[PDB]
Design a protein around this ligand. Sequence first.
Ligand SMILES: C[C@@H]1O[C@H](O)[C@@H](O)[C@H](O)[C@@H]1O
Ligand SMILES: [Cl-]
Ligand SMILES: [Cl-]
Ligand SMILES: [Cl-]
Ligand SMILES: [Cl-]
Ligand SMILES: [Cl-]
Ligand SMILES: [Cl-]
Length: 193
Amino acid sequence: GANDYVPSPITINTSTLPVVVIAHTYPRVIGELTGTSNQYIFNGGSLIALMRGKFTPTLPKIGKITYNFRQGNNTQSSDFDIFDTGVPGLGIIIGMAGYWPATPLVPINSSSIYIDPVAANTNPNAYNGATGSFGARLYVAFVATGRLPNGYVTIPTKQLGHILLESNRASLNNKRLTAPVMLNGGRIQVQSL
Ligand SMILES: C[C@@H]1O[C@H](O)[C@@H](O)[C@H](O)[C@@H]1O
Ligand SMILES: [Cl-]
Ligand SMILES: [Cl-]
Ligand SMILES: [Cl-]
Ligand SMILES: [Cl-]
Ligand SMILES: [Cl-]
Ligand SMILES: [Cl-]
């Protein structure tokens, strides 16, 4: 059908965090995961649409930290909300972007934000150019929020939040399609020298 768009998750992997080699300074970023992308977070309708994605984080917000991702193309630091993994001492920060690399990494630092097009954060009538899918890039860094013991620690799989699909086509907008944004759990290692 014209509006038969379907959601798919976008996921990033804890297992790509390098060994954390250690400072008693909190908060601090202790490494970046490998960024991921999904071109087809929303896909399937037969009629092209102007679309945008609104991201809402749903983990507890501990506080803020200034950071500049080594990945992405931002040249200055921004404020990021630190979200709780649930594991003591460990939080994460999030950036998201449109699928295509020219679009900017958008720091997640408010209760909800448009990740693409970023213009929609100040223009409520702005959408992506018409096409048959909506995708995104996902970036995550781990944050030490307190003292970390030496050795391995397990991070559970966490749902970081969801993307809501919006459109200027009412029938599509009204479906309120949502896609999960996931942190795949895994093992990290701390080496305290
Ligand atoms: C062609 C489509 O362009 C859109 O802007 C993107 O959101 C989709 O991922 C897809 O690449
Ligand atoms: Cl994915
Ligand atoms: Cl990966
Ligand atoms: Cl893809
Ligand atoms: Cl950044
Ligand atoms: Cl969760
Ligand atoms: Cl309409």
